[PDB]
Amino acid sequence: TFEHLNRDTLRYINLLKRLSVDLAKQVEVSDPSVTVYEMDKWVPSEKLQGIL
Amino acid sequence: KGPKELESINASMKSDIENVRQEVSSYKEKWLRDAEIFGKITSIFKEEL
Q1: To which H or E segment does residue B19 belong?
Q2: What is the 8-class DSSP label of residue B1?
Q3: Are B6 and A26 spatial neighbours (Cβ–Cβ below 8 Å)?
Q4: In a 10 Å sphere around its CB, with 0-12 CB exposed, 13-18 middle and 19+ buried, how is residue A7 labelled?
Q5: Helix boundaries (H) for chain A
Q6: How many beta-carbon pairs below 8 A join chains A and B?
Q7: What is the least distance, in Å, from the CA of B12 to any CA of chain A?
Q8: Residues 6+ apart with CB under 8 A from B30
Q9: What is the rounded distance in angstroms from the CA atom of residue B11 to the CA atom of residue A43?
Q10: Which chain A residues have a beta carbon less than 8 Å from that of B5?
């Protein structure tokens, strides 16, 4: 049992940041002032975030 | 296109349609000026008749 629990833990931790799969990142910004966009501060809409 | 993007242009596109209506009003005003010109053209038309 301990051996299974160790192996499963490595898969879970691996499966978080290292093997994660994420969103498309389509970008549209309302403020006209924003002339340059960081492209990493893009987040999903609040309605979609609740479902996720 | 993104629906937020579409919503923003439709605000602007509706604004453009309003501008087109204003332009149609301007064209009608131009037609009225043309009609005043046509009334002076009317003396020449009487001479032509």
Answers
A1: helix B3-48
A2: -
A3: no
A4: exposed
A5: 2-14, 46-51
A6: 7
A7: 13
A8: none
A9: 24
A10: 28
Asked if A28 reaches chain B (Cβ–Cβ under 8 Å), the answer is yes
Chain A CB contacts of B4 under 8 Å are 28, 30
CA B44, CA B19: separation in Å to the nearest integer?
Answer: 37
Taking an 8 Å cut-off on Cβ atoms, the answer to whether B2 and A30 are in contact is no
**A51–chain B nearest CA distance, Å:** 19
Give me B33's structure tokens.
């000026």
CA distance to A1, A21, A47, A52, per residue, from A12 (Å): 17, 14, 28, 19
> Exposed/middle/buried for A42, CB within 10 Å: 0-12, 13-18, 19+?
middle
Tokens of A35: 């002339």
Q: How was this structure determined?
A: cryo-EM
- In the structure encoding, which two tokens stand for residue B14, read together? 């509706």
